[PDB]
Amino acid sequence: MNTRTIYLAGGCFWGLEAYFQRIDGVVDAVSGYANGNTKNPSYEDVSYRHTGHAETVKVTYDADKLSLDDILQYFFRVVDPTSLNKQGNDTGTQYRSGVYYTDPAEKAVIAAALKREQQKYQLPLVVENEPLKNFYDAEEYHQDYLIKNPNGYCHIDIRKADEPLPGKT
Structure with a gap:
């Protein structure tokens, strides 16, 4: 299989991870901490x-x-x-939105996508589009969170993954 990886920051990763995990074509989704100023941070460091x-x-x-x-x-x-x-009520830089790439060529793909998304928004978009400086996997407790905690906190409308993209079924 030919795989590619992209890093997405869109709030509490529990909901975002569960979201991408149910999408056909997604091989894996690992929750972690990206583009910070420290190394090997724990959930507590990032949160406080x-x-x-x-x-x-x-x-x-x-x-x-x-x-x-x-x-x-x-x-x-x-x-x-x-x-x-x-993102809603989750406040702090740890909940900032952004797309981080490992290939400089993707910068333009992300920029164009944001430009098109801006077309439908009245407010200016603030999503970051920068290189993945660093990434650290979150504790195993946080991996597959909603799958283990079927009632846990989820700020994402998970069913939206079910709808097909333009030109797909």
Whole structure:
């Protein structure tokens, strides 16, 4: 299988991870902390010690089934791209929105996607589009969170993953 990876920050990673996990074409989704100022941060550091990390989901997808563009469209369905350092009531830089790449060529793909998303928003988008500086997997307790805690906190409308993308069934 030909896979590609993209890093998405769209608030509490529990909901974002569960969201991408149910999408056909997504191989894996790992919750972690990205683009912060410290190394090997724990959930506590990120949540309270202002390390600068963003709760992020490392999404690995089948490059033969989905394009990066497709993954970004799924992303925009459940994240508010206009709120700075907060997704609803989850406030702080750890909840900032952004897309982090490992390949400089993807920068333009993300920029264009954001540009098109802006077309339908009255408010200016604040989603970050920058290189993945650093990424650290979150504690295993946080992996597959909603799958283990079927009632746990979920700020994402998970069923939106079920709807097909333009030109797909």
